[PDB]
Design a protein around this ligand. Structure first.
Ligand code: OFR
Length: 125
């Protein structure tokens, strides 16, 4: 039930950029979602072995988590805010794909996604 290597957080040949919005995604959006009581399942890549979820990476082919996103933001890995917002949406979507409506893990992702959309509704200029 092995785990794949985690998503890259650096890529020297990918062009970096630092923008007002990406600074905000780290300092405001990520760091406060991180403190939510429901953040803990999403703070690191899914451990299919530890969690006896041996099928997780048979179903999820584009894994993403907030730990990866935080490191990407800290590394200026992203070209723009939309790229990072895409990663957040991948990790929410993955949760909805793998699990079922009403599952408690889905209720946690739904709560975080709602807060996420609340905070990105208005970004700096
Ligand atoms: C089965 C034993 C418990 O294992 C866990 O704690 C889990 C972790 C770390 N992550 C995931 C789990 C899951 O069921 N579906 C997923 O997509 N993820 C990845 C985000 C399970 C889980 C988490 C939280 C609740 C409330 C229930 C189940």
């Amino acid at each position: 039930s092995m785990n794949p290597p985690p998503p890259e957080t650096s890529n020297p040949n990918k062009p970096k950029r630092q923008t007002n919005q990406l600074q905000y995604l780290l300092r405001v959006v990520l760091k406060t979602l991180w403190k939510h009581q429901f953040a803990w399942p999403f703070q690191q890549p899914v451990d299919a072995v530890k969690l006896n979820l041996p099928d997780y990476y048979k179903i999820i082919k584009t894994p993403m988590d907030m730990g990866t996103i935080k490191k990407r933001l800290e590394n200026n890995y992203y070209w723009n805010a939309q790229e990072c917002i895409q990663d957040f949406n991948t990790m929410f979507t993955n949760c909805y794909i793998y699990n079922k409506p009403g599952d408690d893990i889905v209720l946690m992702a739904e709560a975080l996604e709602k807060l996420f959309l609340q905070k990105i509704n208005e970004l700096p200029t």
